[PDB]
Every structure is written in structure tokens, then in C-alpha cells.
């Protein structure tokens, strides 16, 4: 059974944050062999702490580790945008096995904003002939990499048939994402307009398409 | 120190698969090795560990009796035999090295039998990983639809157009434009896995709005897992 971590933690640049890791007498509490790992998107994890509090060679001294009973803790001081990513704890077990924590999403806040570019394509006539329909909402060039996507049929909220990707880093070190709304041709024709709403840092950018338009 | 995984692939549940890991840059015969896996958008899961001389093996409860670790020190290779595969085995699989060295006592450095490393109980080297997908879905080439440029997709001097690559399996599909002649303003988005078990993605390109109707734009979609290639011409709308 995996070790328990908080789903997410967040702080502003320069301040200190702490991630906990809860185990049992047969793992975390039983040994001084807790290690921590940092994982960036599309990357393998890199160790930042081992043996509860030891730092590997070439690891920033901003990273520190401790343990109390069944609770292990990773502390990051002087927060930086570079520190954004997933953090996993790991422990040896009494059965000579290893066990990872559920992982914690660390978000660095107060970073400089970049509004999202949103492009919305209606169903092609070809797809419509195939008795199908897909609305394609493409979101790009935004930062930080956190967005919320909502769909509207006319003025009414829609969640059915919605498929949305998690934001990923671009080559330009900004973020991009996409959302799809699957409808029937009848549903598509049944409304006067459909809207793709992208919320990002307290601001919402909305694009609209209509069956009545070409 | 380097670790390179291979042997990953797409199979139906109940099938078999053999993962391999090529190790270099250190004495493989002296260090313990781990297999660790991570499902798409999920957390890390320790799979197995094997001692430096392979005299001891340990596997996670969730994979015991189906996945098994082994090693060949004459070829510096780590293996993971995968049998009776299940959908939940779907993940990226990492070959990982157990950090190690001598233990210190009474002013002496001690090594294990035959000078094997003692475990330092943390991972210090990771491969980039190999992909394993277990699905009941059957192979299927993509349907390519045009995402035509209109007045509602232009941004002044520039205009956006693309291709919708719909309902294919498995990953990956690759997309180029004008046979690779068009590389600027191009962006291909990651795929979505629909509830149907099939994938879809979109590829978009930004071009001069004035060039529409004069310049031809073709998206080159490539789906090797089905031996399918599609060239799609994207016509500009009059909107
Ligand atoms: C992980 O454990 C910490 C510590 O919890 C303490 O020790 C446990 C073994 C158990 O005895 C708890 O009752 C103890 O509180 C948890 O830290 C607590 O976090 C809450 C809010 O998250 C906070 O209000 C409390 O002050 C914290 N308690 C202490 C002692 O610091 C943490 O919540 C656990 N992580 C989880 C549950 O995801």
C-alpha cells in the first residue's frame, strides 16, 4: 500500500514549503531510509533527498528532509519556478520491498502571466457526412500551465462528450492544451451556437462557432 | 552511467511481453537494479528489485506471479518478463539503478559477497523508459478531417488552419505539413484517449492570411502501427 502524500501544495517564490509522507512501523517509521524524488513533465524522476535528510552530490541546499514517527517531510526553502513539478517520497519496507508515495503536485505561484490563444474549429462537412461531429478547441501559448476548459451549448453548460488534455510544455517553454466536444449532426444543427471557454488566472477567453456560419 | 529500456509495445490483455534494459557506464555485476512503472497521468509504482548477483528477487504484490525480474551480467542486461498482462499494467516502465557502495564499520569499508555493493536504499540512475499499453481495442488507422481556415481563425496577417486526426489506435501518429517543407508556425497537440478506447489529436499551422487561395496546404499524417499514411489537402473557407 502506497505512502500517503497531499495531492497538491503551493507557495510563492522565496518562501518555504513542506510536503509530508505518511507510512507505517514497517516502512517510514521502521527505518531511516526515506528518499525523495522530483519529476518534471515528460521526464524521469531525480532524487533530491535520501536517508531521510541526506542530500545527493550537486543538489541545492534549499532542499531539506526530516522525519517524525510515521511522517516523513520534504522541505523546500527559497521557492523558485524551477521547483515546479511532482514530488514523490519512497521508503524501504520490512519485506525488503520498496514503496512510493502517492506524489504531490507542487505549484509555484505569483509567476508572470501569459494569456492563452484560443482557436475553435467547427465540425468539417466531411465529418458531418460521416454522420459524426467534433468541435475542436485548441489552446496555446499560455503560462502558467494551469487552465480550465468549459463548453456551452447556446447559453447552457455542456459536459457530455467533452474530452480535454492536460496542459503540456511547448518547445517555447510555454503551455498548450486541447479540448474536444463530440456531438451528433442533429445536436450540432439543433443549437444556434456552441462556445469553448478557457479560464486562466481569473480571466476567461471564449470562442464561438455556429452551424449557421458556413 | 546509462540505462536504456526496450521491448515495450501494444498488446491485448492476457498477452505476454519481455522488457529489456541495457546498462553501461558502471559495473553492472556489482549493483542492484529496480523496475519502476508509471501509468499515464498517474504516480510512480515500484515493480521489482534484483540483487547484484541475482541471488535475491523481490516483486510488488500487484504484479507477483505475472511480472518477473531477471538479469544477465555477462551482457549487462536487466529483464522483466511480463505474462498474463492486464489493462492496469498499462504504463511507462523505467529501468532504475539502486544506489550503492561499501558499508562503513570500525574504520573499514565492507562490501557484500564477491565485493557486491551494499544497498544505499535510493535510486540514482533512471532510463528514459519504455511504453507498455494493454488494451482490448483493435488496431485502427486514423480518419483525417480538414480544419479549414476562415475569418474566425485569422489573426491579422496570419491565419490558422489544421487537420483533425480522429479515432486511431494505438499511438503514435506523426504529422508534418507540405512534406516537411512547412515547419514554422506548426504545432501538433498531444492525443486524447476517448471513452471508445480510440485516440484523436489535432495538428495546426499558422500561415500568411494573404497566401490562402494561392498556396496549397497539405498535412502529412503517418500512422505506422497500421501501416497507414494520409495526405490531406486543407481548403480555405469563404467565411
Ligand atoms: C500526514 O501526517 C501528518 C501528521 O499527522 C499526525 O500524525 C498522524 C500519524 C496522525 O496521528 C495525525 O492525527 C496527526 O495529525 C498530517 O498533518 C496534519 O495535517 C492537518 C491538515 O492536513 C493539520 O491540520 C495538522 O496540524 C497536521 N498534524 C500534525 C501533527 O502536524 C497530514 O495531514 C497527513 N497527510 C494526509 C492525511 O494526507
The C-alpha cell 521489482 sits at: B48
Nearest partner of B39 among B126, B123, B125, B133, judged by Cα: B133
List, in sequence order, every residue forming a beta bridge with A104; answer none if it has no partner: A87
Distance of alpha carbon A24 from alpha carbon A17, whole angstroms: 24
List, in order, residues 6 or more apart from A56 with CB less than 8 Å away. Answer: A47, A48, A49, A50, B124
Number of the ligand 1 atom closest to the C-alpha atom of A20: 1
DSSP B151: T
Whole-angstrom distance, CA of residue A139 vs CA of residue A175: 9
Choose the closest CB to A44 out of B34, B129, B204: B129
Residues B209/B217, Cβ–Cβ less than 8 Å:
no
CATH number, domain A1-110, options 3.30.70.260, 3.60.20.10, 3.40.50.2000, 2.60.40.10: 2.60.40.10
Q: Any CB–CB contact under 8 A between B4 and chain A?
A: no
Q: Give which of B219, B216, B217, B130 is closest to B166, Cα–Cα.
A: B219
Cell of A147: 487552465
Locus of grid cell 511522517: A71
Q: Å from A132 to nearest chain B CA?
A: 11
Does the CA dihedral A28-A29-A30-A35 come out positive or negative? positive
Q: Do A120 and B58 touch (CB under 8 A)?
A: no
The grid coordinates listed for A185 are 449532426
B49-58 residues labelled b (16+ CB within 10 A) or e (exposed) = bbbbebeeeb
Method: X-ray
Q: Is the CATH number 1.20.20.10 carried by domain A111-210?
A: no
User: CA-to-CA distance for A149 and B190, rounded, in angstroms?
Assistant: 16
Nearest to A163 by CA among B225, B197, B143: B197
Cell digits of residue B73: 551480467
Q: Is B210 helix (H, G, I), strand (E, B) or coil?
A: helix
Strand order across the A148-153 sheet:
A156-158, A148-153, A194-200, A203-209
CA distance A75 to A105: 14
Contact A29, A91 (CB under 8 A): no
C-alpha cell at B53: 548477483
C-alpha cell at B90: 498499462
Instruction: Name which of B126, B98, B125 is nearest B34 in CA terms.
Output: B98
Residue nearest to atom 4 of ligand 1 (CA): A71
Query: Which cell numbers in the block locate residue A178?
Result: 486541447
- Beta-strand runs (E) in B51-198: 57-59, 67-72, 77-82, 91-101, 103-105, 108-110, 118-126, 130-134, 143-147, 154-155, 158-168, 174-177, 186-188, 192-193
Cβ neighbours of A121 in B, within 8 Å: 147-148, 153, 162, 164
Closest atom, ligand 1, to C-alpha of A7 = 38
Q: Rg of chain A's alpha carbons, rounded to an integer?
A: 23
Rounded to the nearest whole angstrom, what is the distance from the C-alpha of residue A70 to the centroid of ligand 1? 10
How big is chain B, counted in residues?
Answer: 239
- Strand, helix or coil for residue B49: strand
Pick from B210, B217, B205: which is nearest to B157 by CA? B210
What are the domain boundaries of chain A? 1-110, 111-210
Contact call for residues A146 and A110 (beta carbons, < 8 A): no
Query: CA of B12 to nearest chain A CA: how many angstroms apart?
Result: 24
How far is it, in rounded angstroms, from Cα A69 to Cα A2?
Answer: 17
Query: How far is the C-alpha of B115 from the C-alpha of B112, rounded, in Å?
Result: 5
Grid cell digits, residue A45: 524522476
Name residues 101-130 of chain A within 8 A of B (Cβ).
Answer: 101-103, 119-121, 124, 126-127, 130
Q: Which of A126, A138, A165 sits opposite B204 (nearest CB)?
A: A138
Distance between CA B108 and CA B115 in Å, rounded? 14
Residue A91 and residue A34: Cα distance in Å, rounded? 5
DSSP B82: E
Joined grid coordinates for residue A136: 475542436
The full set of domains in chain B, from first to last, is: 2-136 (2.60.40.10), 137-233 (2.60.40.10)
Collect all residues of chain B within an 8 Å Cβ-Cβ radius of residue A92: 121
To the nearest whole Å, the CA of B17 is away from the closest chain A CA by 22
- CB spacing of B123 vs A100 below 8 angstroms: no
Closest CA to B45 of A51, A41, A45, A95: A45
Sorted by sequence, the CB contacts under 8 Å of residue A202 that are 6+ apart come out as: none
- CA dihedral of B25, B27, B30, B31, whole degrees rounded to 10: 0
Cα radius of gyration rounded to whole Å, chain B: 24
Cβ contact A136:A180 at 8 Å = yes
- On chain B, the residues whose CB falls within 8 A of the CB of A57 are none
CB B76 within 8 A of CB B23: yes
Q: A29-49 as b/e, with b when 16 or more CB fall inside 10 Å?
A: bebebbbbbbbeeeebbbbbb
Cell (9 digits) for A144: 502558467
Nearest to B12 by CA among B107, B86, B70: B86
Resolution (Å) of this entry: 2.3
Q: Which three cell numbers stand for residue B212?
A: 490562402
3-class DSSP string for chain A:
CCEECCCEEEECCCCCEEEEEECCCCCCCCCCCEEEEEECCCCCCEEEEECCCECCCCCCCCEEEEEECCEEEEEECCCCHHHCEEEEEEEECCCCCEEEECCEEEEECCCCCECCEEEEECCCHHHHHCCCEEEEEEEEEEECCCCEEEEEECCEEECCCEEECCCEECCCCCEEEEEEEEECHHHHHHCCCEEEEEEECCEEEEEEECCCCC
Q: Which residues contact B105 (CB under 8 A, 6 or more apart)?
A: none
- As beta bridge partners, residue A203 has A200
First to last CA, chain A: 56
- Pairing mode, strands B130-134 and B9-11: parallel
Those of residues 1-20 in A touching chain B at CB distance below 8 A are 2
Residue pair A133/B79 in contact by the 8 Å Cβ criterion: no
Spatial CA neighbour of B33 closest among B80, B74, B65: B80
Q: In angstroms, rounded to a whole number, what is the distance separating the alpha carbons of residues A198 and B164? A: 20
Give the residues surrounding ligand 1 with Cβ less than 6 Å away.
A 4, 6, 20, 22, 70-71
CB pairs under 8 A between A and B: 127
What are the C-alpha distances in Å from B141 to residues A39, B72, B170, B191, B195? Answer: 33, 39, 9, 14, 17
Chain A residues with CB inside 8 Å of B63's CB?
A: none
CB A21 within 8 A of CB A5: yes
For residue B231, the cross-strand partners are B220
- To which residue does cell 528489485 refer? B49
Contacts of A186 (CB under 8 A, 6+ apart): none
Burial environment of residue A14 by CB neighbours within 10 A (0 to 12, 13 to 18, 19 or more): exposed
DSSP code for B140: B
Rounded to whole angstroms, the Cα distance separating A95 from A118 reads: 52
Residue A21 alpha carbon to ligand 1 centre in Å: 10
**In chain A, what residues touch B126 (CB-CB under 8 Å)?**
44-46
Amino acid at each position: 500500500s502506497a505512502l500517503t502524500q497531499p495531492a497538491s501544495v503551493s507557495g510563492s517564490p522565496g518562501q518555504s514549503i513542506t510536503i509530508s509522507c505518511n507510512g507505517t512501523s514497517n516502512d517510514v517509521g521502521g527505518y531511516e531510509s526515506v528518499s525523495w524524488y522530483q519529476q518534471h513533465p515528460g521526464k524521469a524522476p531525480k532524487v533530491v533527498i535520501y536517508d531521510v535528510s541526506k542530500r545527493p552530490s550537486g543538489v541545492s541546499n534549499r532542499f531539506s528532509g526530516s522525519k517524525s514517527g510515521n511522517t516523513a517531510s520534504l522541505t523546500i526553502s527559497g521557492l523558485q519556478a524551477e521547483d515546479e513539478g511532482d514530488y514523490y517520497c519512497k521508503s524501504l519496507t520490512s519485506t525488503r520491498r520498496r514503496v512510493f508515495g502517492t506524489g504531490t503536485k507542487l505549484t509555484v505561484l505569483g509567476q508572470p502571466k501569459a494569456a492563452p490563444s484560443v482557436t475553435l474549429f467547427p465540425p468539417s462537412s466531411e465529418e458531418l457526412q460521416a454522420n459524426k461531429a467534433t468541435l475542436v478547441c485548441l489552446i496555446s501559448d499560455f503560462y502558467p500551465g494551469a487552465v480550465t476548459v468549459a463548453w456551452k451549448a447556446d447559453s447552457s453548460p455542456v459536459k457530455a462528450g467533452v474530452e480535454t488534455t492536460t496542459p503540456s510544455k511547448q518547445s517555447n517553454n510555454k503551455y498548450a492544451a486541447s479540448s474536444y466536444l463530440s456531438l451528433t449532426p442533429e445536436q450540432w444543427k439543433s443549437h444556434k451556437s456552441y462556445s469553448c471557454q478557457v479560464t486562466h488566472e481569473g480571466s476567461t477567453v471564449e470562442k464561438t462557432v455556429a452551424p449557421t456560419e458556413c | 552511467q546509462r540505462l536504456v529500456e526496450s521491448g515495450g509495445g501494444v498488446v491485448q490483455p492476457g498477452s505476454s511481453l519481455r522488457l529489456s534494459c541495457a546498462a553501461s557506464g558502471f559495473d553492472f555485476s556489482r549493483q542492484g537494479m529496480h523496475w519502476v512503472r508509471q501509468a499515464p497521468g498517474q504516480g510512480l509504482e515500484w515493480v521489482a528489485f534484483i540483487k547484484y548477483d541475482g541471488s535475491e528477487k523481490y516483486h510488488a504484490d500487484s504484479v507477483w506471479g505475472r511480472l518477473s525480474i531477471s538479469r544477465d551480467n555477462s551482457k549487462d542486461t536487466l529483464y522483466l518478463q511480463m505474462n498474463s498482462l492486464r489493462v492496469e499494467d498499462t504504463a511507462t516502465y523505467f529501468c532504475v539503478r539502486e544506489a550503492g557502495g561499501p558499508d562503513y564499520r570500525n574504520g573499514y569499508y565492507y562490501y557484500d559477497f564477491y565485493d557486491g555493493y551494499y544497498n544505499y536504499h535510493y535510486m540514482d540512475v533512471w532510463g528514459k523508459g519504455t511504453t507498455v499499453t494493454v488494451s482490448s481495442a483493435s488496431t485502427k488507422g486514423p480518419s483525417v478531417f480538414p480544419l479549414a481556415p476562415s475569418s474566425k481563425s485569422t489573426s491579422g496577417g496570419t491565419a490558422a488552419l489544421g487537420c483533425l486526426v480522429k479515432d486511431y489506435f494505438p499511438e503514435p501518429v506523426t504529422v508534418s505539413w507540405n512534406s516537411g517543407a512547412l515547419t514554422s508556425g506548426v504545432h501538433t497537440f498531444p492525443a486524447v484517449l476517448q471513452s471508445s478506447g480510440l485516440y484523436s489529436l489535432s495538428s495546426v499551422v499558422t500561415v500568411p492570411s494573404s497566401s490562402l487561395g494561392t498556396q496549397t496546404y497539405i498535412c502529412n499524417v503517418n500512422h505506422k502501427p497500421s501501416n497507414t499514411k494520409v495526405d490531406k489537402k486543407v481548403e480555405p473557407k469563404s467565411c
